[PDB]
C-alpha cells in the first residue's frame, strides 16, 4: 500500500482490514500440492523414462541383493513403457470409453417388462457423479465438497471397471448382489474367455438317453 512505501517482509496471503485500516499478511506459501489422479497424472507426465532408466541402471550395480532386485523390478516397468511406446500418463483416464448399447442391452422381454445390464447402472452412477462434479466446479463449491465429489467419481470409475476390487462392492438398492463390472465380464469361470470363447454352444446338435 501507500504507492509502494510499505511492502511485505515475508511470503503470505493478504487480508485487507478496512476497519483497522491495515493490510495484514498471514504467513503462508503458494505451494502447489494436489490430491488424486490429477496429481498422479501430473507426476506421470513429468517422467523422463531414459533418465530413470539410467538411475535404475546405476542402482543395478549395488552390492545389496534386495536393492538390485527392486531396481530390476522397476526397470522392467520403465523399459516396458519405453519399448511399447506407451505414455505412463495413459494409465490415468480422462475420457472413459463407453461400450456399445447392444453389448449392454436394454431389451423388452416376453412379458412386456424390461431387462437391462448392470453396466448401464454403473455408467449411470459415473455420469451422474461427473455431471454433479462439473456443476459443483462451475458454482464455486468449497474444498471439502469438491474433494468428496472427486473421491466419489474415482470410486465410480473403480466400480465400473472392476467392482469390489477396492472397498465394498456397489450393489443395487435393496440387494446384496454385487453388480457386474467389465472385469467380472472378462475373467472368471463364467467369464467371456472360458464361457464364450474357449467353448461355445453350437447349432446342428442334440442329445438323448443312450
Amino acid at each position: 500500500a501507500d504507492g509502494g512505501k510499505v511492502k511485505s517482509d515475508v511470503y503470505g496471503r493478504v487480508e485487507v482490514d478496512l476497519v483497522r485500516n491495515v493490510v495484514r499478511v498471514v504467513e503462508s506459501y503458494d505451494i502447489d500440492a494436489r490430491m488424486g489422479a490429477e496429481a498422479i497424472q501430473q507426476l506421470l507426465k513429468e517422467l523422463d523414462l531414459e533418465a530413470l532408466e539410467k538411475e535404475l541402471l546405476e542402482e543395478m550395480k549395488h552390492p545389496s541383493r534386495a536393492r538390485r532386485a527392486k531396481a530390476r523390478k522397476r526397470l522392467e516397468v520403465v523399459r516396458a513403457f519405453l519399448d511399447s511406446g506407451n505414455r505412463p500418463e495413459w494409465m490415468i483416464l480422462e475420457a472413459v470409453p463407453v461400450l456399445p448399447p447392444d453389448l449392454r442391452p436394454m431389451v423388452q422381454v416376453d412379458g412386456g417388462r424390461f431387462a437391462t445390464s448392470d453396466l448401464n447402472d454403473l455408467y449411470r452412477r459415473l455420469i451422474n457423479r461427473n455431471n454433479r462434479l462439473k456443476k459443483l466446479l462451475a458454482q464455486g463449491a468449497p474444498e471439502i465438497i469438491i474433494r468428496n465429489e472427486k473421491r466419489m467419481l474415482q470410486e465410480a470409475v473403480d466400480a465400473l471397471l472392476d467392482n469390489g476390487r477396492r472397498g465394498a462392492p456397489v450393489t443395487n438398492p435393496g440387494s446384496d448382489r454385487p453388480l457386474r463390472s467389465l472385469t467380472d465380464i472378462l475373467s472368471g469361470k463364467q467369464g467371456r474367455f472360458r464361457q464364450n470363447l474357449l467353448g461355445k454352444r453350437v447349432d446342428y446338435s442334440g442329445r438323448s438317453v443312450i
Partner: protein, 52 residues
C-alpha cells in the same frame, strides 16, 4: 509326463548380463537367451550367463 516336465524346464534366469541389455535376475525363455547368445557369439560379444 516328459512333455509337461519339458514345459516346466522352459525358463532361465540371467546370472550375468554380459554384453546384452539384459538384467541380472531377469527371467526369460531358454530358447530366446540361446538365440541371443548365439547372435552375440557371432557378433564377437560376451554372451549372457544364465541359470536353469
Amino acid at each position: 509326463i516328459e512333455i509337461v516336465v519339458r514345459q516346466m524346464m522352459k525358463y532361465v534366469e540371467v546370472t550375468d548380463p554380459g554384453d546384452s541389455r539384459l538384467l541380472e535376475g531377469q527371467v526369460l525363455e531358454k530358447w530366446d537367451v540361446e538365440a541371443l547368445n548365439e547372435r552375440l557369439i557371432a557378433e564377437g560379444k560376451t554372451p549372457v550367463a544364465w541359470k536353469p
